[PDB]
Amino acid sequence: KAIPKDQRATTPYMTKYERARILGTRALQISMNAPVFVDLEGETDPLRIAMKELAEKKIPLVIRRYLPDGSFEDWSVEELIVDL
Amino acid sequence: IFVYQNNITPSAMKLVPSIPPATIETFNEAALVVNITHHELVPKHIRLSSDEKRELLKRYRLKESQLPRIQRADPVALYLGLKRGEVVKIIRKSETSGRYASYRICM
Amino acid sequence: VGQQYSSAPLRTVKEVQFGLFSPEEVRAISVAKIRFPETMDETQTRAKIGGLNDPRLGSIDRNLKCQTCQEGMNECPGHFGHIDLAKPVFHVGFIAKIKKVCECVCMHCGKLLLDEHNELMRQALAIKDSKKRFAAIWTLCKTKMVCETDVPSEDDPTQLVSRGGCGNTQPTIRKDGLKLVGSWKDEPELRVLSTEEILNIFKHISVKDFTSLGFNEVFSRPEWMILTCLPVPPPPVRPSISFNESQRGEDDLTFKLADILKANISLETLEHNGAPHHAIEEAESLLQFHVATYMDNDIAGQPQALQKSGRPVKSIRARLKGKEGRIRGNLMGKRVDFSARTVISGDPNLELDQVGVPKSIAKTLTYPEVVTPYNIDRLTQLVRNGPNEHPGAKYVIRDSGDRIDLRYSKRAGDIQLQYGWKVERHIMDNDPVLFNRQPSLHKMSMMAHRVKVIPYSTFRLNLSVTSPYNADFDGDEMNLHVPQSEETRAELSQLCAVPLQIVSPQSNKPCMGIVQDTLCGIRKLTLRDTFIELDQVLNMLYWVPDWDGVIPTPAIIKPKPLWSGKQILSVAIPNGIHLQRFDEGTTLLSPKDNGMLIIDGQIIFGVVEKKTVGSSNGGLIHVVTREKGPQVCAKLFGNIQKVVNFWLLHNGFSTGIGDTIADGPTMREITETIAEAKKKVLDVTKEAQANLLTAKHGMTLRESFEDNVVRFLNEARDKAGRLAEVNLKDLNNVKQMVMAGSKGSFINIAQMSACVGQQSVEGKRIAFGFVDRTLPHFSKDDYSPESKGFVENSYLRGLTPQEFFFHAMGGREGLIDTAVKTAETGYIQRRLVKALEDIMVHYDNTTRNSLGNVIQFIYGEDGMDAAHIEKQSLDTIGGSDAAFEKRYRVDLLNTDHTLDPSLLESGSEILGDLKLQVLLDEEYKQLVKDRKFLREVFVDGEANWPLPVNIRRIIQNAQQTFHIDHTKPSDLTIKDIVLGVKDLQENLLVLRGKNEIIQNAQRDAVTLFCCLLRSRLATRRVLQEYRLTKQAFDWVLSNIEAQFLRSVVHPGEMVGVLAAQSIGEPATQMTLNTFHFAGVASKKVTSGVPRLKEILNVAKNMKTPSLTVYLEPGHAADQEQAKLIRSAIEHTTLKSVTIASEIYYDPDPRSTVIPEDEEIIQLHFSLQQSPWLLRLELDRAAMNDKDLTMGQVGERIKQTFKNDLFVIWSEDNDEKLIIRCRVVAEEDHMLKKIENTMLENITLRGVENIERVVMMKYDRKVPSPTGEYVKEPEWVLETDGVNLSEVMTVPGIDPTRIYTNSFIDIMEVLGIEAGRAALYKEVYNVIASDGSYVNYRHMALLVDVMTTQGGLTSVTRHGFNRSNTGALMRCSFEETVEILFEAGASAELDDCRGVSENVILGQMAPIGTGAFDVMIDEESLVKYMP
Amino acid sequence: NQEDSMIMNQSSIDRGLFRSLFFRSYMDQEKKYGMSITETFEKPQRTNTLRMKHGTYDKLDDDGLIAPGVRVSGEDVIIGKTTPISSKRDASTPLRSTENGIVDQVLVTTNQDGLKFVKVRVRTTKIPQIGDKF
Ligand SMILES: [Mg+2]
Ligand SMILES: [Zn+2]
Ligand SMILES: [Zn+2]
């Protein structure tokens, strides 16, 4: 249904399932020969690269969180607080 | 509220739903002898105004049906005389977290 | 997949619209005219006739041809052909409804049989749910059997209004075979209902009439349950099997069709030739038979439709039917590629997360990698390396979508890889794999692992990861699946990884320990008596991979520098570790070297073993994992293991007979300790042969005899051993394995070196199969122990013929309740699981299922993840009102109740401040309001509970992390403490919402916690107990806010399944049909698996239906007050009190031919009938047990029949109580009907159903006036039959604490919500008798699932699997084909939101990883470039 | 040696400890058809059909069998057999894909109906290896 950046309600944190898919999803793309927005300090593993792409929060993705009723809340990996 | 003793004539009862709006109920004596709602296990329910509900829903993105239900003939459903639609707010004690809200629509 | 690109757009399935085939579409879709029944042979010529299978449909012979469609064999789903039937037929499965429907509509005009007019009707026509709005409308029409022409409207029942005409009576109908027959009435008229007619009628049923009945105007009209055009499935459905050429072997289905076709023709040809009118319907049934037996073949109409050779036949249905079939056998579980399996073994040299794969496999399993600049070099390398050298590959693939068989292909050595190509390569060290052992019923049965290619053919794993898999190396085969994408291997790495699994959610504790050698040794290594010298100290140090390379200064130096075992082992324990224990005699100087202290990662004192290093809660592991990280932990096992294992390798360890032989005297001392226990039996033997044995509440004298003997011998064993156990020096290996706890219990010591024990069968020691004795080597009626089965010898001396034999009978028992338990266990396990699939914590923190229905508005009613929880104590609850004050009470206005300045810095400048005693008090009145709150919840008084954030430790850390000193005073403003701990809770947010409703539910899910919080962060506590400083404090607050926030649950977690698993896991281990009570019959209660069965089933007739009732307030210890009510409940009938009934011939109602009766009569005459007497002597003894008085008795009998039967009766003083009476044309006969009517329909005192009842002295704990919690025992009655409704309304009982183990009732009476309460309560117990913990939340969820809906929804085909849940999902459980049928029948529509829904369409199911979508924000994609 | 699994001294394994023999034994007959059509035990090769096996027939003699001394291994053939169909379809029998060893004894006999009957016995030697159970 769409939810404004405001009136936001979900967790401010990142569900492990979220991270893991992102991480996976990214690495996949990296190995798909995709642009990598960080200095590979000499990394050759798409995951490892993704993990870096993440600890510098430079991953162009937005998790769209869907709610039982259909409406969703979009959260970027830039925002999402990565504790774990 | 009508309180019979041994029973009512099946010829009689079929006259209650013949004068709306007004509503009628029927309890046996041996029934009311003890107030169940005082029972260790039964926790307090509560009726909710047709607004506190239109809210509960809104605030939970709930479709009427997705809500836990209570039997029209449920002991406590009677003790508070609910109607097809009214919602009750069962508030119990929890070993996980002292209190624990919960709700129940009425089918 | 399927190769070959297609313009076609690629989408996913969202809805599944089940419908029914209208003949018109069947033809429409069809491509084959399908006329001939033959297969091919164009007169033998090999090919296919434009007749059956391929008159255009798919093909065979590896030939593109498929109506040009080519694509051939693989890449071409057959196409449907049709086959016009000569005369309409029934649909085997739909016969059911086709019938019922008729019953719901009269023929001729075909219309409903109850309009809006009949009132009972309306009430049905409103129920929205085509599934019940039907079985309702039917219940109302199966009766109407006349198509009424006119009925009274809404006005006068004198004026008649008309609707649809023709009243032609409706016929009742019965199912005979595959046809429908009905009768009309006056001497019936039995005629068969021709399909040709039924159809017609249906065809004529109205639109609104469809709908009203469970139907659909577009996808499923009823007229379509009758087959008119038969869809003929193409080849891929009924594939043949060729043995090269000239040898063809077709499929069953292909045959039926044939027969159906044959049958069909022979029928048609009969309506265009000599049609012998009713000799046709003799072959019309054949069609119907085949056309029916084709889809189903397992009917009640016996004929199995066998196929020459006795072969049953495979009905389409037969294919989908669960387990081993289509739905459950090919979809929910597939065999898979990239899988492996072999014997496993233990490697004390691998890391926990690793799994040693043997090369053989590595070289066979391939991970398709993508050629990329990052790899090209290393990749090509493999390619070159070939597929035989290890680090290699075995296929390369180009964009052109084509394989390159590196083991052949001339250009093998050639090849220049390319960006965008892939190279299926060999599995290499460190690839993430999905290891696992069956059977799988645990998250921890499939954990990811770091690959580690190795020699020899056995999968290698680390010991400490043995239990999670629950495997032994006795030739245990394990599996292994290899990830395939990059994202896939990521789901295994970031989620299913062994270290991520160390703390189990279904027991909020570590599920991996430290065993055998390592464990058994880490202890021998710890002792104070264990010193290690230089040379070795080094090698050990070295062995530890993270050793900061700092030889640690020797514990001892003096003449010879040594190191203590504890010392170096400590090198394995990281820094920042803190652990306080205290076993028994522990005193920060623990003489016995008990408990244990570990500071900044160094064992200060105490012997290490199981408790410290096992899967215990606050164990070393539990800490490290929570303190340092899953990583650090796994890495910890290693070290310990390596260090330890090594030292053990050199200290050595053994076991032998010498460890089972005990000190000579301790043997005799045992012998006599046994003998003495024989006389203590013998005594009770004659003392019972001389009738001097108190029956005892123990019921039955005999029953009461045993319970004494047994109890006497056991008492002897246990204790006979307690002798050896203490005589076995601290150097006895066996004892050592026991002490360290690596293996063995003291029992094992007894039974080996002291004495085996008394064997048993169902409880009752060895019975008498041998007519009044045990073995023919015994004298009849010998009740001595050596015959009822008592093994006196120790496993060391060795049993005797007899001992040996009984012993057997005894053991062989388990081996049985394991053969049967196993049969039902499985089923339970599944159901649970299949019931809570779809249940997962959504994003609002709710806990719903595939529909949207809530089931917890907060997982576990607290939104916490099982992983983060432990048994912390609620100091606030326990304790006297006296101490509580001496602890949390701070009064700044009082020389004796203020914080002594030696604690606070601003201590003296406080004593008096009145603005602080406002807060200082706000705090108190709270810890108080709390105390009350708690005692209203945890009535038991129980203070220890499962709660996130261990605050006991969080502080212990805060302690020595700032090296706080118990000498100098703090520096905290009392404003600091209170005002902070208040802000803390403000942030332990569990829910978030911007509105009230939610922000209110927040305060709730938080409550039970804070109380612990405040309980701990008490101003008097914070300073006088643990000298915290502004810093420390401010820290402690920081962690808690986090450790909590981390403790929350992750919106994804499929709890449903988790929950499920966690109950079935233990469910499986439950013992079966035990009954420890047997040997005390009448006090028998249902416990164990049969019980749990009973539950989930929601069974009415439970074996044990008891119900415990507690007295009214005061009336407690009032002994007598007890029976006073006993007899006020326990159903009492005349029959119970009578001793006989006699019919006499006494004609003189003024004198009884009986002597003993005189005196009576005389009395009833000082102050017509019949001559037939009926005299009833009664039992005195039975008139007190359950109080009663002659008066009462008869008095009842009299008001039982009233004025029409004269009665009389002796007086409570006569040595013989009695009751005479006569009646008032056959008198004897009628005076016997009244003989029974007097014994079984006559009540005296009590409630029906409730037979026996008894008194018990329970130990209740309750609020002492002084505050303390104390044991204030109370008497209580336990029923043995159950009728709550009324035993409740009895005076003397507390109808507030009443309870019937039959929640089924406690639900009908007390009301659902309480029902639940009972339900959950019952369940908790079943599981808890094994001593099996299971975090509330789970059972909680289960219970909540059952309830919700309305009442008690069972966990069985008859319940939860009928719900508003979509097809396929239910389709996947017990009723498969059936389900589907009545699905496309009522035009079902599937959300495809339920796991199963997707697993069946091979789509990604909304689950954790799939509980959300991901996206590319092109706008954030720009700002990401320098 | 931990948790039900022992350490077995290899040295003695070599000195012969726990060595086992293992004999298996395939078998085939020349099926007959009343209308005179018989299978046969020959060493075929291409010639119309193509329907053979991947195995190496090259270890067979001319009678369609192998002879003792031989050392079979992968999917090599062990018995040559042909069925005349209306003409070279194989009915030969390979050594079980996962085994390997040495033929050990063969034998041709008559089967009541006067059919050719053979029973090939391939022996192997197995030595106490790690995964092995004791
Ligand atoms: Mg086993
Ligand atoms: Zn095709
Ligand atoms: Zn009609």
**Residue positions counted in chain D:** 134
3-class secondary structure for C1121-1144?
Answer: HHHHHHHHHECCEHHHHECCCEEE
Cα-flanking dihedrals φ and ψ of residue C1266, to 5°?
-70, -10
The A residues from 12 to 71 touching C (CB cutoff 8 Å) are 12-13, 15-25, 27-28, 30-33, 37, 44-47, 58, 60-69
The D residues from 2 to 21 touching C (CB cutoff 8 Å) are 2-5
Cβ atoms C781, C772 nearer than 8 A: yes
The neighbouring-strand residues paired with C1174 are: C1143
**Residue C1390 per-residue DSSP state:** B
Type of residue at C706 = E
C-alpha torsion sign, points C440, C445, C448, C454:
negative
**Residue C855 per-residue DSSP state:** S
Enter the tokens of residue B21. 């709006």
DSSP C1059-1085: HHHHHHHHHHH---S--S--SSTTS--
Type of residue at C1203 = N
Type of residue at C1367 = A
| DSSP element (H, E) containing C367 | strand C366-370
* CB-CB under 8 Å, C937 with B93: yes
Cβ atoms C1112, C1293 nearer than 8 A: yes
Q: Which domain holds residue B52?
A: 35-107
CB contact C465 to B (< 8 Å): no
Q: Which of C291, C299, C235, C285 lies closest to C78, judged by CA?
A: C235
Distance CA C1401, CA C1409 (A): 18
Distance CA C101, CA C141 (A): 10
Class of D20-127 in CATH: mainly beta
Cα-flanking dihedrals φ and ψ of residue C1261, to 5°?
-110, 140
Residue identified by tokens 């209902």 is: C193
Three-class SS state of C1311? coil
Cβ atoms C527, C593 nearer than 8 A: yes
| DSSP element (H, E) containing C631 | helix C630-651
Q: Which residues contact D5 (CB under 8 A, 6 or more apart)?
A: C345, C346, C473, C474
Print burial letters for C570-587: b (CB count within 10 Å at least 16), e (below 16). bbbbbeebbbbbeeeebe
Cβ atoms C1217, C1206 nearer than 8 A: no
Enter the tokens of residue C1081. 């019959």
Nearest bound ligand to the CA of residue C78: 2
| Rounded alpha-carbon distances, angstroms, from residue C677 to C693, C792, C1418 | 18, 11, 87
| Gyration radius from chain A CA atoms | 14
| Rounded alpha-carbon distances, angstroms, from residue C767 to C24, C714, C763, D74 | 75, 18, 10, 61
Cβ atoms C935, C863 nearer than 8 A: no
Chain A partners within 8 Å of C1046 (Cβ): 83-84
Residue identified by tokens 């050639």 is: C414
- List % helix, strand, coil for chain C (3-state, nearest 5): 35, 10, 50
Distance CA C516, CA C518 (A): 6
| Rounded alpha-carbon distances, angstroms, from residue D27 to D120, D121, D123, D125 | 6, 9, 15, 21
What torsion, rounded to 10 degrees, do the Cα atoms C1209, C1212, C1216, C1219 define?
A: 20
Region for residue D19 given its phi and psi (left: phi exceeds 0; alpha: psi -120 to 50; beta: otherwise): beta
* CB-CB under 8 Å, B97 with C1008: yes
Q: In sequence order, what E strands does C600-674 have?
A: 602-605
| Rounded alpha-carbon distances, angstroms, from residue C673 to C718, C756, C876 | 11, 14, 49
Distance CA C558, CA C561 (A): 6
The neighbouring-strand residues paired with C1261 are: C1271
Cβ atoms D39, D76 nearer than 8 A: no
What torsion, rounded to 10 degrees, do the Cα atoms B27, B29, B35, B39 define?
A: -100
Distance CA C398, CA C794 (A): 74
Q: Which of C815, C792, C814 lies closest to C803, judged by CA?
A: C792
Distance CA D94, CA D84 (A): 20
Q: Which residues contact C1118 (CB under 8 A, 6 or more apart)?
A: C1111, C1275
Distance CA C874, CA C1169 (A): 78
Cβ atoms C18, C1367 nearer than 8 A: yes
Q: Which of C1380, C1379, C1386 lies closest to C222, judged by CA?
A: C1386
* Number of Cα atoms under 13 Å in the Cβ half of residue A3: 18
DSSP C680-740: HHHHHHHTTTTT-----TT-SHHHHHHHHHHHHHHHHHHHHHHHHHHHS-TT-HHHHHHHT
Enter the tokens of residue C473. 């190396």
Is there contact between B and D if contact means ≥3 C-beta pairs under 8 Å?
no
Return the residue of B nearest to A69 by Cα. Answer: B61
Three-class SS state of C672? helix
Residue C852 has its nearest CB partner, among B63, B97, B100, at: B63
Three-class SS state of C1048? strand
Chain A partners within 8 Å of B62 (Cβ): 69
Is C836 buried (19+), middle (13-18) or exposed (0-12) by CB count in 10 A? Answer: buried
Three-class SS state of B30? helix
Task: State the CB neighbour count (10 A cutoff) for residue C161.
Answer: 11
Cβ atoms C567, C674 nearer than 8 A: no
Distance CA C1178, CA C1175 (A): 10
Distance CA C1371, CA C1373 (A): 6
Three-class SS state of A72? strand
Three-class SS state of C924? helix
The neighbouring-strand residues paired with C89 are: C227
Cα-flanking dihedrals φ and ψ of residue C478, to 5°?
-125, 160
Long-range pairs of A47-56 with CB within 8 A, sequence gap ≥ 24: A47/A23, A47/C486, A47/C489, A47/C490, A47/C493, A50/A22, A50/A23, A50/A24, A50/A26, A51/A23, A53/A26, A54/A19, A54/A22, A54/A23, A54/A26, A54/A82, A55/A82
DSSP C393-442: BS-EEETTTEEE-TTS-TTSS-----BTBEEEEE--TT-EEEEE-SS--S
| DSSP element (H, E) containing C369 | strand C366-370
Packing angle of the helix pair C996-1016, C974-985 (nearest 10 deg): 140
Long-range pairs of C602-608 with CB within 8 A, sequence gap ≥ 24: C602/C570, C602/C573, C603/C526, C603/C566, C603/C567, C603/C569, C603/C570, C603/C573, C605/C566, C606/C526, C606/C581, C607/C523, C607/C526, C607/C527, C608/C522, C608/C523, C608/C525, C608/C526, C608/C566, C608/C569
Q: Which residues contact A43 (CB under 8 A, 6 or more apart)?
A: A49, A52
Distance between Cα C1008 and ligand 3 center (Å): 67
Distance between Cα C332 and ligand 2 center (Å): 28
Cα-flanking dihedrals φ and ψ of residue C1368, to 5°?
-15, -45
Type of residue at C10 = L
Cβ atoms C1016, C1033 nearer than 8 A: no
Q: Which of C151, C170, C197 lies closest to C106, judged by CA?
A: C170
* CB-CB under 8 Å, C998 with B62: no
Greatest Cα pair distance in chain D: 67
Q: Which residues contact C965 (CB under 8 A, 6 or more apart)?
A: C1027
| Rounded alpha-carbon distances, angstroms, from residue C305 to C175, C231, C253, C289, C296 | 19, 21, 13, 9, 10
Type of residue at C632 = V
Residue C1050 has its nearest CB partner, among A17, A37, A65, at: A17
The neighbouring-strand residues paired with C402 are: C398
Region for residue C1334 given its phi and psi (left: phi exceeds 0; alpha: psi -120 to 50; beta: otherwise): beta
**Residue positions counted in chain C:** 1426
Distance CA B86, CA B106 (A): 6
Distance CA C511, CA C442 (A): 11
Distance CA C62, CA C309 (A): 32
* CB-CB under 8 Å, B100 with C861: yes
Q: Which residues contact C784 (CB under 8 A, 6 or more apart)?
A: C681, C682, C685
CATH code, B85: 3.90.940.20
Antiparallel, parallel or unpaired: β C446-451 and C602-605: unpaired
Distance CA C1256, CA C1277 (A): 6
Please give the positions of C annotated as active site.
Answer: 472, 474, 476, 1076
Residue C854 has its nearest CB partner, among B67, B74, B95, at: B67
* CB-CB under 8 Å, C1350 with B69: yes
Q: Which residues contact C296 (CB under 8 A, 6 or more apart)?
A: C92, C93, C315, C316, C317, C318, C1377
Enter the tokens of residue C331. 């979809």
| DSSP element (H, E) containing C1206 | strand C1206-1207
The neighbouring-strand residues paired with C1096 are: none
| DSSP element (H, E) containing C23 | helix C23-29
Enter the tokens of residue C76. 């071409």
Print burial letters for C134-145: b (CB count within 10 Å at least 16), e (below 16). bebbbebbeebb
| Rounded alpha-carbon distances, angstroms, from residue C60 to B78, C37, C78, C80 | 70, 18, 11, 16
Distance between Cα C35 and ligand 2 center (Å): 20
Q: In sequence order, what E strands does C10-145 have?
A: 84-89
Three-class SS state of C634? helix
Residue identified by tokens 């033809």 is: C27
Distance CA D40, CA D28 (A): 11
Q: After which residues is chain D broken (C to N over 2.5 A)?
A: 86
Cβ atoms C789, C774 nearer than 8 A: yes
Secondary structure tally for chain A: helices H, strands E: 2, 2
Distance CA C1131, CA C1148 (A): 37
Nearest bound ligand to the CA of residue C144: 3
| DSSP element (H, E) containing C1159 | helix C1158-1166
Cβ atoms C216, C19 nearer than 8 A: yes
Task: State the CB neighbour count (10 A cutoff) for residue C1143.
Answer: 13
Distance CA D20, CA C907 (A): 87
Residue A15 has its nearest CB partner, among C370, C493, C1050, at: C1050
Cβ atoms C404, C398 nearer than 8 A: yes
Q: Which residues contact C547 (CB under 8 A, 6 or more apart)?
A: C541, C571
Q: Which residues contact B85 (CB under 8 A, 6 or more apart)?
A: B105, B106
* CB-CB under 8 Å, B63 with A67: no
CA C473 to the chain's CA centroid: 29
Q: Which residues contact C1422 (CB under 8 A, 6 or more apart)?
A: none
Resolution number, Å: 36.0
Q: Which residues contact C1140 (CB under 8 A, 6 or more apart)?
A: C1176, C1177
Which residues from B are below 8 Å from C when comparing CB atoms? 30, 33-34, 36-43, 45, 55-56, 59-63, 65-71, 74-77, 90, 92-103, 107
Three-class SS state of C1278? strand
| Rounded alpha-carbon distances, angstroms, from residue C757 to A51, C753, C754, C805 | 62, 12, 9, 13
Peptide bond into A35 cis (omega under 30): no
Return the residue of B nearest to C1000 by Cα. Answer: B101
Peptide bond into C439 cis (omega under 30): yes
Partner chains of C (3+ C-beta pairs under 8 Å): A, B, D
CA–CA min distance C227, chain D (Å): 43
| Rounded alpha-carbon distances, angstroms, from residue C1111 to C1117, C1181, C1302 | 10, 26, 20
DSSP D12-66: HHHTTTT-EEEE--EEEE--B-TTS-B-B------SS-----SS-GGG--SSSB-
| DSSP element (H, E) containing C822 | helix C821-835
Type of residue at C1225 = A
Distance between Cα C180 and ligand 3 center (Å): 19
